[PDB]
Every structure is written in structure tokens, then in C-alpha cells.
Design a protein around this motif. Structure first.
Motif, PDB file in Angstrom:
ATOM      1  N   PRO D  14       0.819  -1.233   0.000  1.00 28.28           N
ATOM      2  CA  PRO D  14       0.000   0.000   0.000  1.00 28.28           C
ATOM      3  C   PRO D  14       0.845   1.272   0.000  1.00 28.28           C
ATOM      4  O   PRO D  14       1.024   1.958   1.005  1.00 28.28           O
ATOM      5  CB  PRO D  14      -0.815  -0.144   1.287  1.00 28.28           C
ATOM      6  CG  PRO D  14       0.085  -0.913   2.198  1.00 28.28           C
ATOM      7  CD  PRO D  14       0.858  -1.868   1.329  1.00 28.28           C
ATOM      8  N   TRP D  15       1.387   1.595  -1.168  1.00 27.01           N
ATOM      9  CA  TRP D  15       2.192   2.797  -1.294  1.00 27.01           C
ATOM     10  C   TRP D  15       1.322   4.027  -1.053  1.00 27.01           C
ATOM     11  O   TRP D  15       0.154   4.050  -1.457  1.00 27.01           O
ATOM     12  CB  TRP D  15       2.844   2.862  -2.677  1.00 27.01           C
ATOM     13  CG  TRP D  15       3.777   1.731  -2.925  1.00 27.01           C
ATOM     14  CD1 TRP D  15       3.532   0.611  -3.662  1.00 27.01           C
ATOM     15  CD2 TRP D  15       5.107   1.593  -2.420  1.00 27.01           C
ATOM     16  NE1 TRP D  15       4.626  -0.213  -3.649  1.00 27.01           N
ATOM     17  CE2 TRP D  15       5.609   0.368  -2.895  1.00 27.01           C
ATOM     18  CE3 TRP D  15       5.925   2.391  -1.614  1.00 27.01           C
ATOM     19  CZ2 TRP D  15       6.889  -0.077  -2.592  1.00 27.01           C
ATOM     20  CZ3 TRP D  15       7.194   1.946  -1.317  1.00 27.01           C
ATOM     21  CH2 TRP D  15       7.662   0.721  -1.797  1.00 27.01           C
ATOM     22  N   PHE D 131      11.121  -2.558  -4.011  1.00 27.02           N
ATOM     23  CA  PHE D 131      11.079  -2.723  -2.561  1.00 27.02           C
ATOM     24  C   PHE D 131      11.364  -4.164  -2.156  1.00 27.02           C
ATOM     25  O   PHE D 131      12.111  -4.409  -1.202  1.00 27.02           O
ATOM     26  CB  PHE D 131       9.733  -2.276  -1.998  1.00 27.02           C
ATOM     27  CG  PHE D 131       9.655  -2.378  -0.502  1.00 27.02           C
ATOM     28  CD1 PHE D 131      10.263  -1.429   0.299  1.00 27.02           C
ATOM     29  CD2 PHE D 131       8.999  -3.438   0.102  1.00 27.02           C
ATOM     30  CE1 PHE D 131      10.205  -1.523   1.673  1.00 27.02           C
ATOM     31  CE2 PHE D 131       8.937  -3.534   1.477  1.00 27.02           C
ATOM     32  CZ  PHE D 131       9.539  -2.578   2.261  1.00 27.02           C
ATOM     33  N   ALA D 132      10.778  -5.134  -2.866  1.00 29.97           N
ATOM     34  CA  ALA D 132      10.963  -6.534  -2.500  1.00 29.97           C
ATOM     35  C   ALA D 132      12.387  -7.005  -2.753  1.00 29.97           C
ATOM     36  O   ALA D 132      12.940  -7.755  -1.945  1.00 29.97           O
ATOM     37  CB  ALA D 132       9.968  -7.413  -3.255  1.00 29.97           C
ATOM     38  N   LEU D 133      13.035  -6.609  -3.832  1.00 27.74           N
ATOM     39  CA  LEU D 133      14.440  -6.926  -4.132  1.00 27.74           C
ATOM     40  C   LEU D 133      15.402  -6.243  -3.191  1.00 27.74           C
ATOM     41  O   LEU D 133      16.403  -6.797  -2.882  1.00 27.74           O
ATOM     42  CB  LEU D 133      14.719  -6.524  -5.587  1.00 27.74           C
ATOM     43  CG  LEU D 133      16.170  -6.627  -6.047  1.00 27.74           C
ATOM     44  CD1 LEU D 133      16.403  -7.957  -6.732  1.00 27.74           C
ATOM     45  CD2 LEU D 133      16.514  -5.475  -6.981  1.00 27.74           C
ATOM     46  N   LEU D 134      15.070  -5.052  -2.758  1.00 22.73           N
ATOM     47  CA  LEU D 134      15.944  -4.370  -1.811  1.00 22.73           C
ATOM     48  C   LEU D 134      15.904  -5.034  -0.441  1.00 22.73           C
ATOM     49  O   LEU D 134      16.929  -5.126   0.242  1.00 22.73           O
ATOM     50  CB  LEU D 134      15.534  -2.905  -1.711  1.00 22.73           C
ATOM     51  CG  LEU D 134      16.518  -1.896  -2.281  1.00 22.73           C
ATOM     52  CD1 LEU D 134      16.803  -2.239  -3.723  1.00 22.73           C
ATOM     53  CD2 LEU D 134      15.889  -0.533  -2.187  1.00 22.73           C
ATOM     54  N   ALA D 180      16.165   4.501  11.208  1.00 24.06           N
ATOM     55  CA  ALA D 180      16.621   4.085   9.883  1.00 24.06           C
ATOM     56  C   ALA D 180      16.730   2.564   9.805  1.00 24.06           C
ATOM     57  O   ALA D 180      17.797   1.989   9.607  1.00 24.06           O
ATOM     58  CB  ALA D 180      17.945   4.760   9.544  1.00 24.06           C
ATOM     59  N   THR D 181      15.583   1.914   9.964  1.00 28.07           N
ATOM     60  CA  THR D 181      15.511   0.476   9.777  1.00 28.07           C
ATOM     61  C   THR D 181      15.555   0.127   8.293  1.00 28.07           C
ATOM     62  O   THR D 181      15.383   0.979   7.417  1.00 28.07           O
ATOM     63  CB  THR D 181      14.241  -0.090  10.412  1.00 28.07           C
ATOM     64  OG1 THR D 181      13.091   0.377   9.696  1.00 28.07           O
ATOM     65  CG2 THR D 181      14.139   0.345  11.859  1.00 28.07           C
ATOM     66  N   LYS D 187      11.477   1.632   1.908  1.00 26.41           N
ATOM     67  CA  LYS D 187      10.252   2.342   1.566  1.00 26.41           C
ATOM     68  C   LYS D 187      10.551   3.769   1.126  1.00 26.41           C
ATOM     69  O   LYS D 187      10.019   4.245   0.117  1.00 26.41           O
ATOM     70  CB  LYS D 187       9.305   2.335   2.765  1.00 26.41           C
ATOM     71  CG  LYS D 187       7.927   2.871   2.466  1.00 26.41           C
ATOM     72  CD  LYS D 187       7.534   3.939   3.464  1.00 26.41           C
ATOM     73  CE  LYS D 187       6.148   4.466   3.164  1.00 26.41           C
ATOM     74  NZ  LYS D 187       5.166   3.354   3.053  1.00 26.41           N
ATOM     75  N   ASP D 188      11.412   4.462   1.872  1.00 28.90           N
ATOM     76  CA  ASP D 188      11.721   5.851   1.552  1.00 28.90           C
ATOM     77  C   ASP D 188      12.428   5.965   0.207  1.00 28.90           C
ATOM     78  O   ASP D 188      12.110   6.852  -0.597  1.00 28.90           O
ATOM     79  CB  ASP D 188      12.568   6.465   2.665  1.00 28.90           C
ATOM     80  CG  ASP D 188      11.745   6.848   3.880  1.00 28.90           C
ATOM     81  OD1 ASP D 188      10.515   6.999   3.748  1.00 28.90           O
ATOM     82  OD2 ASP D 188      12.327   6.982   4.973  1.00 28.90           O
ATOM     83  N   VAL D 189      13.382   5.072  -0.065  1.00 25.21           N
ATOM     84  CA  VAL D 189      14.117   5.157  -1.320  1.00 25.21           C
ATOM     85  C   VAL D 189      13.228   4.776  -2.498  1.00 25.21           C
ATOM     86  O   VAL D 189      13.373   5.333  -3.590  1.00 25.21           O
ATOM     87  CB  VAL D 189      15.406   4.312  -1.266  1.00 25.21           C
ATOM     88  CG1 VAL D 189      15.119   2.847  -1.511  1.00 25.21           C
ATOM     89  CG2 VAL D 189      16.424   4.833  -2.270  1.00 25.21           C
TER      90      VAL D 189
END
Ligand SMILES: CCCCCCCCCCCCCCCCCC(=O)OC[C@H](COP(=O)([O-])OCC(O)COP(=O)([O-])OC[C@@H](COC(=O)CCCCCCCCCCCCCCCCC)OC(=O)CCCCCCCCCCCCCCCCC)OC(=O)CCCCCCCCCCCCCCCCC
Ligand SMILES: CCCCCCCCCCCCCCCCCC(=O)OC[C@H](COP(=O)([O-])OCC(O)COP(=O)([O-])OC[C@@H](COC(=O)CCCCCCCCCCCCCCCCC)OC(=O)CCCCCCCCCCCCCCCCC)OC(=O)CCCCCCCCCCCCCCCCC
Ligand SMILES: CCCCCCCCCCCCCCCCCC(=O)O[C@@H](COC(=O)CCCCCCCCCCCCCCC)COP(=O)(O)OCC[N+](C)(C)C
Ligand SMILES: CCCCCCCCCCCCCCCCCC(=O)O[C@@H](COC(=O)CCCCCCCCCCCCCCC)COP(=O)(O)OCC[N+](C)(C)C
Ligand SMILES: CCCCCCCCCCCCCCCCCC(=O)O[C@@H](COC(=O)CCCCCCCCCCCCCCC)COP(=O)(O)OCC[N+](C)(C)C
Ligand SMILES: CCCCCCCCCCCCCCCCCC(=O)O[C@@H](COC(=O)CCCCCCCCCCCCCCC)COP(=O)(O)OCC[N+](C)(C)C
Ligand SMILES: CCCCCCCCCCCCCCCCCC(=O)O[C@@H](COC(=O)CCCCCCCCCCCCCCC)COP(=O)(O)OC[C@H](O)CO
Ligand SMILES: CCCCCCCCCCCCCCCCCC(=O)OC[C@H](COP(=O)(O)O)OC(=O)CCCCCCCCCCCCCCCCC
Ligand code: HEM
Ligand code: HEM
Lengths: 57, 28, 68, 244, 244, 57, 28, 69
Positions: D14-15, D131-134, D180-181, D187-189
Motif C-alpha cells: 500500500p504505497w 522494494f521486494a528486491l531491496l 533508519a531500519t 520504503k523511503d528510497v
């Protein structure tokens, strides 16, 4: 009231002016309402809602 | 029907010019 | 020019209601659409849906049979 | 067989910017830019973005000005015909980490870190996939060995990625104080990358709402107009002699 | 002021390539190219000319290949990501004396030696102008003074040129033993430059002669055709009732 | 010209073939003649007449 | 029996025109 | 609207006539006719152009001479 309501129906130039004015005002009013509801739906996410906005170091 | 029509169509043209080009700020 | 004989009676557009007819006879409208068109609809939906489902089943079976 | 070749599917998240009337989270954009600067930019370029693009989105004019002035940009030629360096301006693009593609490959095992300006638009399910790959480096399935220099990632096609894991806890210091978890930084990037790929999204959405409402009103009017014009024909009584 | 501003007009020289069936003098082209590469090239670029262009015009393929091999051309980047050097090939353009225009100006007192690839087409009466300028260095008229770093040349507009006189006697040596006087090298280098500006000239003139002759035949046939079709009208006898 | 007429002009297909052949052969002949004039007018100026051709050290 | 002769004549014409546009002497 | 005409026209086949010799037939009369009919027209076209050109060159020459020491 009756003066404009009789000019709009009887002279096409007045009707054409009424169309132009209605387009102008209606498009502005929808732009305004659409932005109000956009602001309400996105509270805190704006560029100017950034707490650290102005302190890069 | 000739002068009144000319005035009406000039008013319509001026309104359309104000509507297409919107120089709200050139009233100086 | 075709030689025509007819009598045509017409009413002015400003003496009749313009939109209410959209929603009149609505059950008749739905019934006619379904009863006249269900064969055509079947002939259109059945091959596409059947081919799609068969392809999905083929892919699932092939994926399972390559596992250990 | 083919399962690894395609890669594991990325889930749907949910972006904050999904939805016909949803804006970006600009604080998150600024945080993701900080993440980019301190982690991503070491090996990824964003050549379609310039410091002036951040103004009014995540920084003020002065903040972006100072940030640009902290870098060195090749300029010239001077009057003597020799190149030189100068502090960057607002119009300068984000600095490149490598001189060319070959130099990028040589410093990264022969694999080229792609430009991230359009990455979210350049992959299927781009935001969710990134997001999932990161956040998806984990140990490989039993019976799967990863050759030296690569790292396993089920979301990456083939499963073996040349990028090491670099989203780790406390990898960034956030000016706003949010922890900074790993998930926060990812999410932020991704928010920052989503904005960078699609900087026109908010104006475009604001236009789609207004114009679909107006065009729907116009469609109602047009239906009434057609029916009014055609009523004289549809209600007419036709009298002929024929029967069969 | 009045006349010095436009300069002295150049004469008309009988160039061997002038005439509707006249070709270039290719030995003169080869001599002019040696003059270029021995005198001109240290300051003027010819960025439009490749080594392959000389093949079949003034040099054999092996000759031009060795010529190109003599020069050092930048190339790359390599697999490691660095620019390197390699011998020149037939496909390389002629080398540039300077790295950029600013370097040229810095090396020539602020003046930029123009590229000579199209110079005979880029000046009025180009071939005659270039020949007259090269051989037209002499003392200024009485009462005219030239500032240091400039040289008087009445052909140049204004009369003060940044080029020093370069076509000094025996400034080159010719492979065929042609005595290399200033006029000889001037004519040869202008032949080479004129070929460089218009390398298609010989094909163009052959095409022109052929097709103008054929089109003249076609015009005679067209006249006969028109008059044949119109003779029934032009020779007709018309009888009408009217007099005045 | 009536004898040539009975062989070339009786059928439009033959006439059209004759036109195609005339274009081909006449253009070749004109090209050859123009090249002959060009060679005769430019004696000694050709690339193949360079005395030192092949002799660049 | 003239349509066949017309076809043969026009076929000869078409062949002549082909060899004339493309001129494949270096390929034959 | 069609016109109503009364006329008799006789015509000879194009293949019964000489096609080209009429171009060079009574040439001096043709030149006579072109010159005699067109000399005013030709004067009005040429004289302003040549006069203006000559005057401009004359002005340029005298101006150049006046500025010479
Ligand atoms: C509204 C309720 C309509 C119900 C109704 O028919 O009247 C009551 C009616 C009772 O009296 P009636 O005698 O039958 O009505 C006859 C009418 O008087 C006879 O009126 P008419 O049939 O000649 O047409 C008049 C019409 C009004 O005319 C129109 O329909 C055209 C409207 C277009 C407006 C476009 C405006 C665009 C610009 C707006 C400006 C805004 C600001 C400016 C912004 C501009 C920026 C540039 O009124 C309507 O019927 C509304 C229809 C709504 C569209 C239907 C779409 C169907 C899909 O009730 C019914 O007919 C049955 C109701 C059953 C439920 C139906 C619900 C339908 C809803 C769809
Ligand atoms: C009395 C007591 C109450 C009794 C009644 C109460 C019950 C009903 C109350 C609610 C009434 C709802 C509205 C009226 C229904 C209606 O629309 O009729 C149209 C239509 C009229 O019958 P028709 O003779 O077939 O019309 C064809 C004529 O050519 C029509 O030609 P026309 O020139 O006369 O009219 C022009 C146009 C009238 O149009 C309008 O008036 C505008 C309507 C507003 C549209 C707003 C657009 C907003 C877009 C942005 C949102 C997304 O056509 C229509 O009438 C509607 C056509 C469909 C509407 C959409 C049109 C847009 C173009 C669609 C094609 C583009 C497709 C793109 C690709 C999609 C696929 C990939 O009726 C139907 O199509 C039947 C299907 C729908 C029936 C639903 C029934 C549900 C169950 C109800 C209870 C059943 C037992 C009773
Ligand atoms: C493209 C189409 C051109 C517009 C059509 C104008 C027209 O025909 O007049 C319409 C007018 O309707 C329109 O669609 C008006 C269009 C408005 C045009 C806006 C003008 C834009 C300005 C141009 C730039 C101005 C600067 C110069 C008449 O509508 P009626 O329903 O017949 O009503 C008139 C009858 N009665 C007076 C009795 C009411
Ligand atoms: C991309 C293009 C591919 C998509 C193409 C979709 C549209 C193609 C069909 C156009 C042909 C027109 C057929 C039509 O109008 O519908 C049929 C029938 O339509 C159907 O049967 C539709 C079947 C499919 C329904 C959808 C199923 C789910 C999807 C009725 O035609 P008529 O015989 O003229 O009937 C006139 C009306 N009256 C009853 C009064 C006589
Ligand atoms: C322009 C388009 C090309 C021309 C195509 C139409 C050719 C018309 C035709 O039928 O051929 C021409 C001539 O053909 C051409 O000129 C075209 C040949 C072009 C070559 C192929 C490309 C006919 O010549 P005639 O004056 O009618 O005389 C022939 C008949 N008879 C001698 C019996 C009187
Ligand atoms: C292998 C067979 C030959 C193949 C070629 C066939 C086509 C040949 C081209 C025609 C050549 C003959 C040209 C006409 C010769 C006659 C000259 C002459 O007298 O002028 C003619 C008119 O003829 C002309 O106007 C000249 C038209 C010539 C058209 C140009 C020919 C083109 C040559 C093509 C060659 C191929 C090379 C081109 C390939 C692309 C006078 O006409 P009249 O006034 O009606 O009669 C005067 C009376 N009296 C006879 C007594 C003098
Ligand atoms: C009336 C007939 C139908 C219409 C055709 C019109 C013809 C009338 C003339 C129209 C004016 C022609 C153009 C006017 C200016 C051209 C002159 C000019 O600008 O100078 C050029 C020179 O102009 C010419 O060279 C004129 C060429 C005319 C073509 C003559 C060749 C004929 C070939 C076929 C023979 C035709 C015989 C027919 C027999 C039936 C450039 O000279 P250069 O020193 O720079 O280069 C040297 C080299 O020779 C030029 O490339
Ligand atoms: C139509 C008139 C076109 C104007 C030119 C006249 C016809 C072509 C002959 C050009 C002669 C010329 O100056 O150069 C040829 C040239 C003389 O010019 P040169 O190169 O300066 O000697 O002589 C030849 O090469 C042979 C003559 C040309 C063929 C004449 C055919 C008729
Ligand atoms: C958090 C910061 C980073 C982000 C958001 C990021 C993002 C990405 C993305 C989206 C890809 C492409 C995956 C694909 O092909 O679909 C990628 C590939 C790559 N990244 Fe990064 N990256 C980051 C940091 C780094 C760093 C620091 C390095 C180098 C040390 C790096 C090196 C690479 C390499 C080498 C590839 C190519 C991998 C391959 O083809 O196997 N990345 N990165
Ligand atoms: C034979 C050898 C050379 C030839 C044929 C040649 C040709 C030319 C030509 C055609 C121009 C253009 C003049 C104009 O704009 O009208 C020019 C200008 C110039 N040349 Fe060269 N050049 C030669 C050698 C050199 C050399 C050796 C130098 C420097 C050492 C040089 C420096 C310049 C400069 C500075 C200009 C511009 C002067 C000004 O605009 O005031 N040239 N040359």
C-alpha cells in the motif's frame, strides 16, 4: 433577473457571452473544489509539511 | 439590429479574449 | 427517386419528455437482450475462457512435474 | 526449471501514492533522496534528475543550492583552452559515479548497475519489485549454490544478483529522527525513485479528476441533445398500406 | 575605412578544373595535400576529410593506409574503462591541431584559424581569393600602420590578418621534383582545397553534360510532338458569318 | 520508314520493348561518348597519370 | 488466339523493362 | 451555358502536313513584328533598371574619389 434572462434567449451574442462566462467560472470552481478535496485527502504529505524543511545540515 | 448586434458581438469577442488569454495582473 | 405513399404524424421535440424512456420497459429490454443474444455470447465467451483455463492447468501440471 | 528463470513474484504494497486522488509523501521523498546520496549514488547514476528538480518537492532553493555547491563539475574550456572544475549549480545533473559503462562494469564484477532515473517505470510492478528486491536478500533454497561474487535473491530473475545487500539497519542518519531500519529505508528510497521516474504524477492526477467529472457532465448533456433531436423521429406514427 | 574594409578584389586565375568538361589536376591535388600536411595542418583543421577520401584521387589504398598509421588516434574506452591510443585507419578523419577552438585562439593570439574543408566554397570567388591571399603578403600603403601580431594583406578584409606569411620559397619538398616556389605551392594547395570542398565535381560535370545533351534532344522531340498534335488546329480554315 | 513500321509499330508491346531497348542502348552509347570526350579533354590530369603513384615513402 | 500473343508480347516487354531498371550484368 | 454557334471548319490530318518548317518561315517579318510592336514596352522595362544601376555606380565612384587623400 428578467433583463439578462430575456437577452440570453433572444440575442445569440449575449448567449455566446453567457457560454464563455459559464465556462470560465465553472472550470475555475471545479479546479478549486478538486484541489480542496485533494488537500483534504493528503494531509501531512505536502512539500511544506516537511518538519526539517529548511535545515539540510 | 445592426449597431446593437455589433456591440453585442464586440462584447462577446472581448469576453472571449479575456477568457482565452487570462491576464489577471495586467490591469495595471 | 422511389415513389412513396405514406402518412407521417410527428410531435415537436419540445412537447415530449426526453430521458425517461431510457428506464421504461426495463425488464423487457433486459429479457430481449438476454434471450436473443445468449447463443452469440456463449459462442464468444466459451472458447476464450476454456482455452485460458486449459493453458493455466497445463502450466500448473508442467510446473509440478518438474519439481523434486 | 523455469521457476528460477522468471524470479519470485513481488507482493503488492500500500504505497502512499497509489490511488486516483493520492499524492506523494514528500518527507519520504526527501528521506529516500538522503538514502540515495549516502548509499545508492556510490554505484548508481540518476542522469535524468538535476538539483533544480528537488526544489519545491523535498528541499528549498537554498538547500539544493548548497547541496549542488558541495559537488565538483567539469566545466570549460576556459580562455586558454583548458578544462577545469567548479562547484555545481542548480541546473547541474546528479553526478555520475563512473566515467563510462565499461568503468562501471570493471568496478562491479562486470555487471553494470543500471541508471535509476526510470527504474520504477522500467520494470513490471516497479515500485513493489524494487522494494521486494531491496529487502529480499536471504539464504538460497536447499540444493542451490551461488557462484562467488553473486548473492542470492529470489525476486531477481535467475536468482543470482551482482549487487550486494546494502540496505542495513542504521545505514543512514535521518535528519527527521525516524529510525533508519531496513524496511524504512527501502520504503523511503522507493518513494524517492517513484517520484524521480514520474515527477508529473500529481498534476496529472489533479487533471484526470477535474476532466473526467467535466467530460461525464458533457456526456449527460450530449445524450440529452441527441435524444431531443431524435425524439421527433422516434415518436412518429407511420401509416402504410402494406401488411406482409 | 572605405576601401580597406572590403579589401582588394582577387583576380581571375585560369584554374585547370574550370570548364564544362574540365577535371581536377590530380597530381596537383597530391602536391597540394603534401603542402597542407607539411605547412597548414599545424594550425588548420580539415575535419570533413578522411584518409579514405584520398584513395583513388591522390593516393593508392596502401599509401593512405600508411599515412593514417603514422598518426595517433584516441579510442576506447577499453574493458577496464580507460581511453587509449591506436594507429590511424582509412576511416579516421584528418587530425585536429588543437583540442578546441579556445586552444586555437590561445595559440594564435586570439584568432581562430578556420577549418579549411569548405573554405573555397565559404568565401566569395573562393579559389582565386585563397590563392591571392596566400601569395599577397606585401608592404602596407604609405600612412597605414599595422599593430604587432598582425600582418598586412590587402586581400584580407581590413588589411590586417593574424596569419603570418607561410608560403615562403621552398617551404615544402615535392616528391616529383616540382620546384616549390611560393606560386607553385599556392596553386597546388588551392587545387587540393578546391577538391576538398567539392569532391563530387567530376561526377557532377559528367552527369551534367550527358543529361543536358539528352534533354536537348528531348526538347526537340517535344516541340515536334506538340506541333504535330496542334497542326490540325493551327491549319484549320474557319468560315463565319460576321464581318465587322 | 514504312518497312520499320511493319516490324516495330504494328503492336504496342513490340513498340514498348523497342522504347525500353532504345533507352538502354542510347544511354549507354551517350555515356561512352561523353566519357571519351572527357578523357580527350583532360589528358595527363587523371589519378592514374600521377608519375609517383605508389611511390610515397 | 490473339490474347496469348498479347500476353507473350507484354511478357517480353516486362522482362526487357526488368533487365533495364535493375541491370544485373554483374550478377548473371 | 452552352453557346449557339454557326460555323464551317475544314481540317487536314496532322500526317498530311509539314510540322517544323513553319518555325523558320518569314523569320525577318517575325523579328520585325516583335520589335515594332514591343519597343515601348522594352524601353519602359530596361531604361529604369539600367539608368538606376548606372547612377548608383557613378555615385559610388565619385564618393570613393571624394574620400581619397
Ligand atoms: C434526476 C432524477 C430524474 C428522475 C425523473 O425522471 O424525474 C422524476 C420522474 C417523475 O416525473 P416524470 O414525469 O416521469 O419526469 C419527466 C420529466 O419531467 C421529463 O424530463 P426529460 O425526460 O425531458 O429530461 C429532463 C432531465 C434533465 O435533462 C438531462 O437529463 C440532461 C442533464 C445534463 C446536464 C449537463 C450539465 C453539464 C454542466 C453542468 C454545469 C455545472 C457547473 C458548470 C461547470 C462547467 C465547467 C465548464 O431530467 C432527468 O430525467 C435526469 C436524467 C439524469 C440522466 C439519466 C442518465 C441515465 C443513465 O421520475 C421518473 O421518471 C422515474 C424515476 C425512477 C428512478 C429513475 C432514476 C434515474 C437516475 C439515472
Ligand atoms: C417507474 C418506477 C421506476 C422504474 C425504474 C427504476 C429502475 C431503474 C432506475 C435506475 C435507472 C438507471 C439509469 C437508466 C438505465 C439505463 O442506463 O438504460 C440505458 C439502456 C437503454 O436501453 P437501450 O435501448 O439498449 O439503449 C441503447 C440506445 O442506443 C441508447 O441511445 P441514446 O442516444 O438514447 O442514449 C445515449 C446513452 C446515454 O448515456 C447517458 O445518458 C450518460 C450516462 C452517464 C455516464 C457517465 C459517464 C461517467 C464515466 C466516468 C466513470 C467511469 O446511452 C444510454 O442510454 C446508456 C448506455 C450505457 C451508458 C454508458 C454510455 C457511455 C459509453 C459506453 C461505451 C464506451 C465503452 C468503453 C469500453 C468499456 C469496455 C472495455 O438500458 C440498457 O442498456 C440495459 C442495461 C442496463 C440495465 C440495468 C438494469 C439493472 C436492474 C434494474 C432493475 C431491473 C428491473 C426493473
Ligand atoms: C465549433 C463550433 C462553433 C460554435 C457554434 C456557434 C453557434 O452556432 O451558435 C450557437 C451558440 O452555442 C454555442 O455552442 C456557442 C459556442 C461558444 C463559442 C465560444 C467563443 C470562443 C471565443 C473565441 C476567441 C475570442 C477572441 C477573439 C447557437 O446555439 P443555439 O442552441 O442555436 O442557441 C441560439 C438560439 N437562441 C439565441 C435563441 C438561444
Ligand atoms: C478490439 C476489437 C475486438 C472486440 C469487438 C467487440 C465488438 C464486435 C461486435 C460488433 C458487431 C455488432 C453486433 C451487435 O450489434 O450485437 C448483436 C448481438 O450482440 C451480442 O450478441 C453480443 C454478444 C457478446 C456479449 C458480451 C459477452 C461478455 C463480454 C446485435 O446485432 P443486431 O443483429 O444488429 O441486433 C440489433 C438489435 N435488435 C435486437 C433490436 C435487433
Ligand atoms: C507516364 C507513365 C508512363 C507511360 C505509360 C503509358 C504508355 C502508353 C502507351 O500505350 O504506350 C505509348 C508509348 O509508350 C511509351 O512511350 C511508354 C514506354 C515506357 C517504357 C517502359 C517504362 C503509346 O504510343 P502511341 O503514340 O500511342 O503509339 C503506339 C501505337 N501505334 C504505333 C500503333 C500508333
Ligand atoms: C536502330 C534504329 C534507330 C533507333 C532509334 C530510333 C529513334 C531515332 C530518333 C529519331 C531520329 C530522326 C530524327 C528526325 C530526322 C529528320 C530531321 C528533320 O528533317 O526534321 C524533321 C522533324 O524532326 C524533328 O523535329 C527532330 C526530332 C528528333 C528527336 C530527337 C531524337 C532523339 C534521339 C534518341 C537517340 C537515343 C539516345 C538517347 C537515349 C536516352 C522535319 O519535319 P517536317 O517539318 O514535318 O518535314 C520537313 C520536310 N522535309 C522532310 C523535306 C524536310
Ligand atoms: C531555352 C532552352 C530551354 C531552357 C534552357 C535555358 C538555357 C538558357 C540559359 C539560362 C541561364 C543559365 C544559367 C545562368 C548562369 C549560369 C552561369 C554561371 O553561373 O557560372 C557557372 C558556369 O556556367 C556554365 O558552365 C554553363 C553550362 C551550360 C551547359 C552547357 C553544356 C552543354 C552540354 C550538352 C550540349 C547541349 C547541345 C545541344 C545540341 C542539340 C559556374 O562557373 P564556374 O567558374 O564556377 O565553374 C566552371 C564550370 O565550367 C562550371 O561548372
Ligand atoms: C548548346 C551550347 C552549349 C555551350 C557549349 C557548347 C557545346 C559544348 C562544347 C564546349 C566546348 C568547351 O568550351 O569545352 C570543350 C573543350 C575546349 O575547352 P578547353 O578544355 O578549355 O580546351 O573541347 C573539347 O573537349 C572538345 C569540344 C567539345 C565537343 C563539342 C561538341 C559540339
Ligand atoms: C540502496 C541503494 C541501491 C538501490 C536502490 C539499488 C537498486 C538497484 C536496482 C533496482 C537494480 C536492478 C535490478 C534489476 O535488474 O532488475 C540494481 C542492480 C544493481 N545494483 Fe544496485 N541499488 C543500490 C545500491 C547499490 C550499490 C551500493 C551497488 C554497488 C556496491 C549496487 C550495485 C548494483 C549492481 C552491480 C547491479 C547489477 C546487478 C545484476 O545485474 O546482477 N547497487 N540496483
Ligand atoms: C599554406 C598554409 C595555410 C593556408 C593555405 C591557410 C589558409 C587560410 C585561410 C583560407 C584563411 C582564411 C582567411 C579569411 O578568413 O579570409 C586563414 C586564416 C588564418 N590562418 Fe591559415 N592557412 C595556412 C597556414 C597557417 C599557419 C601556419 C597559421 C599559424 C601559424 C595560420 C593561422 C591562421 C589564422 C590565425 C587565421 C585567421 C586570421 C584572422 O582572421 O585574422 N594559418 N588561413
Amino acid at each position: 433577473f428578467e433583463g439578462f434572462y430575456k437577452l440570453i434567449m433572444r440575442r445569440n451574442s449575449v448567449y455566446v457571452t453567457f457560454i464563455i462566462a459559464g465556462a470560465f467560472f465553472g472550470e475555475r470552481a471545479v479546479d478549486y473544489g478538486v484541489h480542496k478535496l485533494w488537500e483534504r485527502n493528503n494531509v501531512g504529505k505536502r512539500y511544506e509539511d516537511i518538519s526539517v524543511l529548511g535545515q539540510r545540515p | 439590429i445592426d449597431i446593437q448586434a455589433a456591440a453585442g458581438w464586440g462584447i462577446a469577442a472581448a469576453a472571449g479574449a479575456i477568457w482565452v488569454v487570462q491576464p489577471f495582473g495586467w490591469i495595471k | 427517386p422511389v415513389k412513396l405513399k405514406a402518412v407521417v404524424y410527428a410531435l415537436s421535440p419540445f412537447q415530449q419528455k426526453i430521458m425517461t424512456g431510457l428506464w421504461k420497459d426495463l425488464p423487457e429490454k433486459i429479457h430481449h437482450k438476454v434471450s436473443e443474444n445468449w447463443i452469440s455470447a456463449t459462442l464468444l465467451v466459451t472458447p476464450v475462457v476454456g482455452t485460458y483455463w486449459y493453458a493455466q492447468y497445463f502450466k500448473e501440471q508442467e510446473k509440478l512435474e518438474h519439481r523434486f | 526449471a523455469d521457476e528460477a528463470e522468471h524470479g519470485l513474484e513481488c507482493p503488492n504494497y500500500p504505497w502512499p501514492h497509489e490511488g486516483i486522488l493520492s499524492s506523494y509523501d514528500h518527507a519520504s521523498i526527501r528521506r529516500g533522496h538522503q538514502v540515495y546520496q549516502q548509499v545508492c549514488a556510490s554505484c548508481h547514476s540518476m542522469s535524468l534528475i538535476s538539483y533544480r528538480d528537488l526544489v519545491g518537492v523535498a528541499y528549498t532553493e537554498e538547500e539544493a543550492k548548497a547541496m549542488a555547491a558541495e559537488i565538483e563539475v567539469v566545466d570549460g574550456p576556459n580562455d586558454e583552452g583548458e578544462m577545469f572544475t567548479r562547484p555545481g549549480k542548480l541546473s547541474d545533473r546528479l553526478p555520475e559515479p563512473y566515467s563510462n559503462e565499461s568503468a562501471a562494469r570493471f568496478a562491479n564484477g562486470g555487471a553494470y548497475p543500471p541508471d535509476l532515473s526510470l527504474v520504477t517505470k522500467a520494470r513490471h510492478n516497479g515500485q513493489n519489485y524494487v522494494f521486494a528486491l531491496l529487502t529480499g536478500y536471504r539464504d538460497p533454497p536447499a540444493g542451490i549454490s551461488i557462484r562467488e561474487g553473486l548473492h542470492y535473491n529470489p525476486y531477481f530473475p535467475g536468482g543470482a544478483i551482482a549487487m550486494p545487500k546494502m540496505l542495513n539497519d542504521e545505514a543512514v542518519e535521518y535528519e527527521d529522527g525516524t529510525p533508519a531500519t531496513e524496511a524504512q529505508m527501502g520504503k523511503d528510497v522507493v518513494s524517492f525513485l517513484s517520484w524521480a521516474a514520474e515527477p508529473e504524477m500529481e498534476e496529472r492526477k489533479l487533471m484526470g479528476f477535474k476532466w473526467i467529472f467535466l467530460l461525464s457532465l458533457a456526456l449527460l448533456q450530449a445524450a440529452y441533445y441527441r435524444r431531443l433531436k431524435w425524439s421527433v423521429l422516434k415518436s412518429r406514427k407511420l401509416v402504410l398500406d402494406v401488411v406482409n
